[PDB]
Amino acid sequence: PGSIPLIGERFPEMEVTTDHGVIKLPDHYVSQGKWFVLFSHPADFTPVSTTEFVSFARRYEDFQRLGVDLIGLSVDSVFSHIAWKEWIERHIGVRIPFPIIADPQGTVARRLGLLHAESATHTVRGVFIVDARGVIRTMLYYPMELGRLVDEILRIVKALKLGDSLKRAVPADWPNNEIIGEGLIVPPPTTEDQARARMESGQYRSLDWWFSWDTPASRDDVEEARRYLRRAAEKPAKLLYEEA
Amino acid sequence: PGSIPLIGERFPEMEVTTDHGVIKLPDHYVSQGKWFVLFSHPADFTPVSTTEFVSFARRYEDFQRLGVDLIGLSVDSVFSHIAWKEWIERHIGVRIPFPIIADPQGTVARRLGLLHAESATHTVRGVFIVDARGVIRTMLYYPMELGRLVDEILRIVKALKLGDSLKRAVPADWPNNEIIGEGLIVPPPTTEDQARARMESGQYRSLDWWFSWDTPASRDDVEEARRYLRRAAEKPAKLLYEEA
Amino acid sequence: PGSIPLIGERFPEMEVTTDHGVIKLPDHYVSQGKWFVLFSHPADFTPVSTTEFVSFARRYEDFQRLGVDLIGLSVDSVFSHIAWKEWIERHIGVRIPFPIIADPQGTVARRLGLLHAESATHTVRGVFIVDARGVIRTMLYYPMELGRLVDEILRIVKALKLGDSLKRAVPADWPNNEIIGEGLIVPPPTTEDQARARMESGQYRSLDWWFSWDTPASRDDVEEARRYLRRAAEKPAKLLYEEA
Amino acid sequence: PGSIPLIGERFPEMEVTTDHGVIKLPDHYVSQGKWFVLFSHPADFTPVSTTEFVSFARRYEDFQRLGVDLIGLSVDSVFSHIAWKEWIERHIGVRIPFPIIADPQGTVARRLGLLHAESATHTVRGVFIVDARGVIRTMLYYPMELGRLVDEILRIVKALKLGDSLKRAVPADWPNNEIIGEGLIVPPPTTEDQARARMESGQYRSLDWWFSWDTPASRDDVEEARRYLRRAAEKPAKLLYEEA
Amino acid sequence: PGSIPLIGERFPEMEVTTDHGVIKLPDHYVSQGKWFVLFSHPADFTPVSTTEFVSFARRYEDFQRLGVDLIGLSVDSVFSHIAWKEWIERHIGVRIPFPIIADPQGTVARRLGLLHAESATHTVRGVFIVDARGVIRTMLYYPMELGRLVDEILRIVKALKLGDSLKRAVPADWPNNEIIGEGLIVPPPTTEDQARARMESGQYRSLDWWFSWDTPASRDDVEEARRYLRRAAEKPAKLLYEEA
Amino acid sequence: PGSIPLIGERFPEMEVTTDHGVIKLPDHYVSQGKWFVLFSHPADFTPVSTTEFVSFARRYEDFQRLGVDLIGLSVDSVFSHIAWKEWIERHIGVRIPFPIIADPQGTVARRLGLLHAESATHTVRGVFIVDARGVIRTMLYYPMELGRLVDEILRIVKALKLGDSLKRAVPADWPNNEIIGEGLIVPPPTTEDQARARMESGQYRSLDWWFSWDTPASRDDVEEARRYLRRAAEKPAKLLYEEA
């Protein structure tokens, strides 16, 4: 095994060097009232990492629209990072606009538990989604061999943000859940007094005292969510390789 | 601040009580040469959890076609599990065909590190993807308030199996990656002599020494993957609560 | 091979989650000047436990008349508890008015020694009778396979209360003792004086120095108690399965 | 707190001195295929204990009818045991047919956890129901100041034996349960499949997959049980104080 | 071996439960100005002990006349002590005036070294003769099998009181000594001047320097003693067995 | 605060210097099949000790007839023992037949706990009565100031020897007990079977279950016993001082 920070803990305090200069996590993001997705990759100048970083750049304004910043992690140098970014701009025509953490001896890696058994020296494809309070809201561990579905990360942070906003719980596959479509869920009641009270109010739709829901999501909220998935699903019109 | 087993490690050898009887992990699945997805949820008779089991159930057929068995996990007794399975069948019309671990003391949860600081007692929405060799291939930790995208887990397993058999890495957002679409990446070369040999071989497409792909996935394997993501994106015709 | 709190000891301080919310034992019931009977059962949605919970419910008023609150305890979740109470409301037409502690990591079970060699995960049929001072006055440990006789818990609480207020001890089988029927016993002399003085006063009936009694219980007290045992003893008029 | 033996363990191995001789527990009873009730009491030449010993005495033939021996426990000298047995036979005309353990150094008291906070020198009113395999089946800790209800102890072994004999769980207040009367519960299913094999079968009366019962006990078996409770209920016609 | 209090040591400080209620040894008898005789015995309702307590009772006046209180001791409950005194009065017609300590743990027994090799649980026939100042003056240990000669116990206290008050030593078998009859001995001189001065004064009878004596006891003091030994020697008038 | 040998322990092994030569205790005496009576005394050339040795001396034949040798004990030299013995022979005209131990370093004093708070140098007036199996049967500790009653030591050995051979216990003040005179007590029964078999047999006279006796002592044994106490009681005809 190996240690990781846990959902509901504040992200570990740490000063990191990135290719945008030094930043203290998670405060930098907290102080701007912003979320950050931090995401690790094994090595600059490798192809899946490239496809991955292009995906994240291609959706930068989708993440800016939600008040979420991006930050890569990798044990390559700051000089390695800027030359890789220069490659991608040159050979693919994409500026990579967000900073990348440099971590040469593996300190930040070790701290976030990003060294698994594939490799003693290269991080896995780890994802830490953090809220404006500086709290880890979700963690994904993808291997070396498999690139992430960046659109699922978007659905997470939108869904989470509606949840806290609307005091609600998000069903499976939202906003295309097969039971209650784009319905958000009301936290199950923890006493019999709330159970009965809630039922009597008919302020909600109900399958039973625990499963109560409604559609407080704005039309645009739901479309923002559904675009994320339409895009994930859509075969690409042109490929960025046919202009390189 | 929490211990977990790691990508590349054997799934911890344990015996567990399920509402289908006692089974050894990962032994039970290795014997049959099946992969398995093990997912946790905080309690029976909660609503986000109910959506997840129904999602997993509607896709059971899909998982079975890949050779993936499913197994749930929570701290509730077997007697809750079967009473919650019964409730779902009478209210939503869906039989849940896969076993659910019962872990009333939190033994299995502490061993897989599914007790995050959202709860001392209730498991978070963990996902372990284990191959037929009994090795953890991917781990997802969603929280209490957010249901999972079950179609992403299908993509993950499909991609990972494809990667293994074709001896390839899988680009971001496959099979709809913006650079090489449904192409699979040749693992990056680890010497310049190799890199040069590869370019001269002529037999891959290449953006550079370290970025070669081809399209070795069958037409069918790709449309299977593409269906997963499209189902995820579609707004459903019939909601399941309606015909209660 | 197990530790338990002892008769004469204050019930141990603990905050507990119940399906009526968080409460501190024994402080919650001491506050109100009330006795309480905490009782435990293996698991929700199990038949014997169900029969027991009905039987306690049907005697709720008998217990309220005595100033006795009831509280349940299992390792099932608050969401299992309410789902069950509801099953009982709808299948049997009986509403469980008293709270049930949920205790999903076995903290309370372990603290009260309610885990015995029949099961490591599920609690035996323990009964704790605590007076209004917060003191443990009786303990019953029944097993999985055998339901309790609730009327005996009624008899136990009633007699103890009489005993307390009347400064009297209570013969076997009270108030149907073959030697003194509904009599109550003078605590035996602890000296020769007390013995020869008592026998000289005609305050009491006697068989010897140490066996002295009187009949100080109101005919109401004694009918309350005999009413309990008569119910225990009577083949029931109609079953609750019959009008389901 | 203080340590006790637990339901489902072998009765601790011990050689005890009784007023019938030295015997080994549980071997003496086991080797005769007999169950035993070991019950304790603070002191000889005290009135409540006296009501209790007379209470077991009048029920000796009903215990023998069930295959059950009795044995007492007190820190008094085997000399006190006989004098006190004499007194009772003299001044009440009842002979106490069964042994009483002498425990002058409270060795057996301490091994059985029968010295509570009440008295450090005198045992509480403990009851260990031990079966034909020397396995503890039930424990009951009554205080100094409250006689036991010996017929509940008859109801317990009667029910345990029926449950053993017929492979059944005994409902609350059996054989007069408000729900199924004299019915005996089929232990609930532990898997989704066993659960459905039960219902489709139609072999038993059911409220749901977990709540299944039949009437396997004989009419003599049920009358025996009832007789016990009716004896508890029925007001005594003659008191034994009337013929000192 | 075993530990005992020593002749010349202040009686150990202790609070005892007795059948006349709690008292504090030796201060209880010190503050009253009285000597006391503590005597252990094995067990209540045994015959030797019975004979000894009657012998003590039948001499209670002789002892009170001398300013000496009796107190027994044995491991039995206060409750046996009362029943045993009651039997002695009903069957033999003597009532036991003096207290009997209850030592049901063996605390006083261990603390006075009265648990000897014959029995781990029952006390031997110990005797402590404690003076006005609360000092142990003499100690006798008789076994289980041999009742004491109580008139020797009276001789001892009488002889000590004359010794103490008259400033003298008491010869062998006083007051019937082969050599000096009722005479009391002048403590041997400890110097030359003292031995000279003694011989020359003829203040005493003397066989030599060290052996000197006079007769300074009153006729009462001597007759009171001779009478103790007379009682011991004289076969009894009428036996207390031919009346009950 | 003193270690001593116990009733029921073998007298301790030791090689000792006496004025009849060196002897191994208790082996020297267990060899001859003879009991023995060890009596320490403060110091040679002191008056009480002399009167006590004269007394022991005058009873030498009474002791020999019983099968019982004597050994005195004292921290003075062999040479003081002989010089003192000679003084007695000259001045009182009694030869001391029995040996006396010399203990100048107080080893034997120490080893038998005869060094009490009266004096840390001079042993008190202890009496060890040892049987032919070399086992301590009785102990008496007297002080400096109080000479022993040697007739009681004779009564003890006679009574003890009788009780051993006859398999009886000895009442108080035997052979002149106020209840049963010269009777000897059947040791009390330990079972209920034994107790009532006794009552109906009429093998013995009985006050109750536990109290039975008979007169199995020969006329000679009783007179021997009763002439011991006669002597104690009787005012001596001629004192031995008168002819010095």
Torsion angle (degrees, nearest 10) of CA F80, F86, F87, F88: 110
SS3 label, residue E121: coil
Nearest-CA neighbor of D129 among D48, D15, D26, D50?
Answer: D26
User: Whats the size of chain B, residue-wise?
Assistant: 244
Structural domain ending residue among the three candidates A104, A122, A145: A145
For an interface test with C, the pick among B18, B22, B40, B80 (most C C-beta atoms closer than 10 Å) comes out as B80
Q: How many CB pairs under 8 A join B and D?
A: 25
* A84: Cα separation from own chain's centroid: 23
F187, with CB counted inside 10 A (0-12, 13-18, 19+), is: middle
- State phi, psi for F81 to the nearest 5 degrees: -50, -50
Closest CA to F112 of F2, F34, F8: F2
* Nearest to A41, CA basis, from A81, A73, A78, A3: A73
**Pairwise CB contact (< 8 Å): B122 & C106:** no
Whether residue C62 is found in the same domain as residue C180: no
Q: Work out the angle at residue A161's Cα, subtended by the Cα atoms of residues A158 and A163, and round it to the nearest 5 degrees.
A: 110
Show the tokens assigned to F25.
């205790």
Alpha-carbon radius of gyration of chain B: 20
Quickly count: other Cβ atoms within 10 Å of residue E197's Cβ.
12
User: Taking phi first (over 0 means left), then psi (-120 to 50 degrees means alpha), and beta for anything else, what does residue E168 get?
Assistant: beta
Say which residues have a Cβ less than 8 Å from residue E205's Cβ, sequence separation at least 6: E180, E183, E212, E213, E214, F241
Breaks (C-N over 2.5 A) in chain F follow: none
The reply to whether B31 and B79 lie within a common domain is yes
Four-point Cα dihedral D23, D24, D26, D28, nearest 10: -50
Inter-chain CB proximity F210 and D20 less than 8 Å: no
Angle ∠(C153,C158,C163) on CA atoms, nearest 5: 125
**Residue B35 shares a structural domain with residue B138:** yes
DSSP H or E run through B89 = helix B78-92
In 3-state terms, what secondary structure has residue D12? coil
DSSP, collapsed to helix, strand or coil, labels residue F201 as helix
The SS3 assignment for E220 reads helix
- Method used to obtain the model: X-ray
Nearest to F58 by CA among E172, E149, E187, E225: E172
- Give the closest residue to F213 by CA, choosing from F240, F179, F190, F238: F179
CB pairs under 8 A between C and E: 24
Cα gap B9→A141, rounded to integer Å: 13
Instruction: Give the chain E residue whose CA is nearest to the CA of D104.
Output: E121
Which amino acid belongs to residue F94?
V
| DSSP code, position C209 | T
Report CB contact under 8 Å: E45, D121: no
Which residues share a beta bridge with F150?
none
Instruction: Check if the beta carbon of residue A84 is closer than 8 Å to that of residue A43.
Output: no
Q: Residues near E40 by Cβ (< 8 Å), separated by ≥ 6?
A: E72, E73, E74, E109, E112, E114, E123, E124, E125, E126
DSSP state of C41: -
DSSP code, position C12 = P
Whether residue B138 is found in the same domain as residue B158: no
CA-nearest of B119, B120, B41, B123 to B84 is B41
Q: Output the six-digit token pair for B197.
A: 């040999």
Hey, of D49, D50, D80, D91, which one would you mutate to test binding to chain E, going by the most E CBs within 10 A of its CB? D80
Residue D197 token pair: 């094999």
**Roughly what angle, to the nearest 10 degrees, separates helices E219-233 and E150-166?**
160
- Give the C-alpha distances (Å, rounded to integers) separating A23 from A14, A15, A28, D174, F204: 9, 6, 6, 72, 105
CB contact under 8 Å between D178 and C58, yes or no, is yes
On whether both F41 and F90 belong to a single domain, the answer is yes
Chains within contact range of chain E (3+ C-beta pairs < 8 Å): C, D, F
Chains near B, with 3+ CB pairs < 8 A? A, C, D
Alpha-carbon distances, residue E131 vs A53, E17, E114, E235, F157 (angstroms): 101, 21, 20, 32, 29
Does residue C133 contact residue C32 with C-beta atoms inside 8 Å? no
Are D198 and C78 a contacting pair, CB within 8 Å?
no
CB atoms within 10 A of CB B15: 11
Distance of CA E102 to the CA centre of its chain: 20
Q: Give the position of tokens 């009501």.
A: D51
Nearest to D191 among B21, B83, B86 (CB): B21
SS3 label, residue C130: strand
d(CA D119, CA C7): 10
Distance in angstroms (rounded) separating the CA atoms of residues A161 and A225? 11
**What CA dihedral angle connects C86, C89, C95 and C99, to 10 degrees?**
-20
Q: A106, A135 in Cβ contact below 8 A? A: no
Residue A47 shares a structural domain with residue A138: yes
Nearest to E45 among D79, D105, D120 (CB): D79
Last residue of a domain, one of C115, C145, C175: C145
- Which residue is it, tokens 């645009």? A220
Return d(Cα F88, Cα F50) in angstroms, integer. Answer: 8
- Give the chain B residue nearest C110 (alpha carbons): B105
Distance between CA atoms of residues A43 and A59, nearest Å: 22
The alpha carbon of residue E209 is apart from the nearest alpha carbon of chain C, in Å, by 56
Contacts of F220 (CB under 8 A, 6+ apart): none
Q: What share of chain E is helix, strand, coil (3-state, %, to 5)?
A: 35, 20, 45
- DSSP label of D13: P
Q: Are E21 and C194 in contact (CB under 8 A)?
A: no
Q: Do chains F and A touch (3 or more CB pairs under 8 A)?
A: no
Q: Helix (H, G, I), strand (E, B), or coil: what is residue E166? A: helix
* Separation between Cα atoms, residue C229 and residue C155, nearest integer Å: 8
Is C in contact with F (3 or more beta carbon pairs below 8 Å)?
no
| Burial tier of A204 (Cβ tally within 10 Å: 0-12, 13-18, 19+) | middle
Q: Which of B50, B142, B212 sits opposite A211 (nearest CB)?
A: B50
| DSSP secondary structure letter of residue F241 | G
Mark residue B167 as left, alpha or beta (left: phi above 0; alpha: psi -120 to 50; beta: remaining).
Answer: left
Contact D171, D185 (CB under 8 A): yes
Considering only CB atoms, D121 lies closest to which of E44, E46, E104, namely: E104
Q: In terms of residue numbers, what domain contains F193? A: 146-244
Which residues are registered as beta bridge partners of F15? Answer: F24
Q: Which of E3, E6, E167, E182 is most worth mutating to test chain F (most F CB atoms within 10 A of its CB)? A: E6
The DSSP line for F105-163 is T-HHHHHHT---TT-SSS--EEEEEE-TT-BEEEEEEE-TTB---HHHHHHHHHHHHHH
User: Could you give the CA distance from residue C167 to residue C188 in angstroms, rounded to a whole number?
Assistant: 12
Instruction: Please judge whether C209 and E86 are an interchain contact, meaning their C-beta atoms are less than 8 angstroms apart.
Output: yes
Chain F residue with CA closest to D22: the answer is F191
Half-sphere exposure of E208 (CA within 13 A, CB side): 13
DSSP-assigned states of every residue in E36-105: EEEEE-S-TT-HHHHHHHHHHHTTHHHHHHHTEEEEEEESS-HHHHHHHHHHHHHHHS----S-EEE-SS
Mapping DSSP to helix (H, G, I), strand (E, B) and coil, where does residue E20 land? coil
DSSP for B117-158, please give it: TT-SSS--EEEEEE-TTSBEEEEEEE-TTB---HHHHHHHHH
Which of D191, D206, D207, D209 to probe by mutation at the B interface, max B CB count within 10 Å? D191
F126 and F160 co-located in one domain: no
* First-to-final CA distance of chain A: 43
8 A C-beta contact, residue E44 and residue D77: yes
Distance in angstroms (rounded) separating the CA atoms of residues D190 and B81? 10
Q: Are E98 and E56 in contact (CB under 8 A)?
A: yes
**Residues 6+ away with beta carbon under 8 Å from F112:** F4, F5, F12, F38, F40, F126, F128
CA atoms of E241 and D109, how far apart (whole Å):
39
* Shortest CA distance from C188: residue in chain E: E79
Interface list for chain E against chain C, based on CB atoms closer than 8 Å: 19-21, 78-79, 82-83, 85-86
- B interface residues, C as partner, C-beta within 8 Å: 43-46, 75-77, 79-80, 82-84, 87, 104-106, 120-122
On the question of a cis peptide bond just before residue F26, with omega within 30 degrees of 0, the verdict is yes
Handedness of CA B226, B232, B233, B237 (dihedral sign): positive
Q: Residue C108 gets which letter from DSSP?
A: H
**Residue among C105, C119, C122, C123 with most chain B CBs within 10 A, to mutate:** C105
Pairing outcome for strands C68-74 and C100-102:
parallel
Buried b (16+ CB within 10 A) or exposed e, C78-110: bbbbbbbbbbbeebbebebebbbbbbbbbebbe
Query: Rounded CA gap, D18 and D85, in Å?
Result: 13
The rounded distance, in Å, linking the Cα atoms of E121 and E105 is 9
Nearest to C236 by CA among D181, E43, A80, B205: D181
Select from B210, B111, B152, B225 the least CA-distant residue to A142: B152
Q: Which among A166, A173, A163 has a CA at the least distance from the CA of A137?
A: A163
Provide the residue type at C232 as one letter: A
Q: Mark F70-82 as b/e (b = at least 16 C-beta within 10 Å).
A: bbbbbbbebebbe
Is the domain of E38 the same as that of E50?
yes
> C-chain residues within 8 Å CB-CB of A185?
none
Residues of C in contact with B79 (CB under 8 A): 43-46, 76
**Among the listed residues C130, C121, C101, the one whose alpha carbon sits nearest the alpha carbon of residue C35:** C130
Token pair in block for residue C29: 């019931």
CA angle E39, E44, E49 (to 5 degrees): 50
Chains E and D touch (3+ CB pairs under 8 A): yes
Q: How far apart are CA F175 and CA F165, in angstroms?
A: 16
Distance CA(D25)–CA(D112), nearest Å, equals 12
Look at residue F32 and give its three-state secondary structure.
helix
Interface with D, mutate which of B19, B71, B96, B98 (most D CBs under 10 A):
B19
Residue of chain E minimizing CA distance to C191? E19
Pair (E24, E134) in one structural domain:
yes
Tell me, yes or no, whether chains D and B touch by having 3 or more C-beta pairs under 8 A: yes
The Cβ-side half-sphere exposure at E226, using a 13 Å CA radius, reads 16
> Is there a contact between D82 and F208 if contact means CB atoms under 8 Å apart?
no
How many Å apart are CA D146 and CA D142, to the nearest integer? Answer: 7
Q: How far apart are the first and last CA of chain E?
A: 44
Task: Please give the full DSSP string across F148-160, using - where no structure is assigned.
Answer: --HHHHHHHHHHH
- What is the rounded distance in angstroms from the CA atom of residue A184 to the CA atom of residue A202? 16
Percentages (nearest 5) of helix, strand, coil residues in chain B:
35, 25, 40
Which residues does chain C have within 8 Å of residue A192's beta carbon, measured at their own beta carbons?
19-20, 82, 85
B116 and B182 in a single domain? The answer is no
- Are β-strands A68-74 and D136-142 bridged in parallel, bridged antiparallel, or unpaired? unpaired
Strand A125-130 with A35-40, pairing: antiparallel
**Contact state of B105 with C75 under an 8 Å Cβ cutoff:** yes
Q: Which residues of B touch D209 (CB under 8 A)?
A: 82, 86
Residue D27 DSSP SS3: helix
Phi first, then psi: give them for residue C220, nearest 5 degrees.
-65, -50
Whether residues C221 and C110 share a domain: the answer is: no
B203 token code pair? 């037999």
Count of CB atoms within 10 A of residue C237's CB? 6
Chain D contact partners (≥3 CB pairs within 8 A) = B, C, E, F
A59 and A88, same domain (yes or no): yes
Q: Are D139 and C198 in contact (CB under 8 A)?
A: no
Q: Is the peptide bond before D175 cis (omega within 30 degrees of 0)?
A: yes
Contacts of F195 in chain D (CB under 8 A): 82
E134 touches E11 (CB < 8 A): yes
> In chain F, whose CA is at the least distance from the CA of D78?
F190
Provide the pairing of β-strand F68-74 with F35-40: parallel
Domain count, chain D: 2
Query: Which residues, 6 or more positions from A205, have their beta carbon under 8 angstroms from its beta carbon?
Result: A180, A183, A212, A213, A214, B241
Domain end residue (candidates: B95, B124, B145): B145
Structural contact between residues A96 and A125, judged by C-beta atoms closer than 8 angstroms: no
Q: How far is CA F225 from CA B23, C214, E59, E121, F159, in A?
A: 86, 55, 22, 32, 8
Backbone angles phi, psi at A147, to 5 degrees: -70, 145
Using beta carbons and an 8 Å cutoff, which residues of D are at the interface with F? 19-21, 78-79, 82-83, 85-86
CA atoms within 13 Å, Cβ hemisphere of B116: 26
Alpha carbon separation from D68 to A75, B206, D28, D71, D162 (Å, rounded): 76, 88, 12, 10, 14
Handedness of CA C58, C60, C66, C70 (dihedral sign): positive
Q: Say if strands D212-214 and D205-206 run parallel, antiparallel, or are unpaired.
A: antiparallel
Instruction: Answer whether A59's CB lies under 8 Å from A150's CB.
Output: yes
Of E80, E87, E120, the CB nearest to D44: E80
Whether B240 and B92 have beta carbons less than 8 Å apart is answered as yes
**Cα–Cα dist D221/D175, whole Å:** 10
| D177: nearest Cα among F198, C148, F238, A123 | C148
Q: Which helix (H) or strand (E) holds F3?
A: strand F3-4
Query: Concatenated DSSP letters for chain A?
Result: -EE---TTSBPPPEEEEEBTEEEEETHHHHHTT-EEEEEE-S-TT-HHHHHHHHHHHHTHHHHHTTTEEEEEEESS-HHHHHHHHHHHHHHH-----S-EEE-SSSHHHHHHT---TT-SSS--EEEEEE-TT-BEEEEEEE-TTB---HHHHHHHHHHHHHHHHHT-BBPTTTTSBTTTBT-EEE---SSHHHHHHHHHH-SSEESSSS-EEE--S-HHHHHHHHHHHHHHHSPPSS-TTTT-
State how far Cα B43 lies from the chain centre: 20
**Coil, strand, or helix at residue C194?**
helix
Q: Judge whether F114 and F73 are in contact, CB under 8 Å.
A: yes
* Contact list, E172 vs chain F (CB under 8 Å): 48, 51-52, 54-55, 147-150
Resolution (A): 2.9
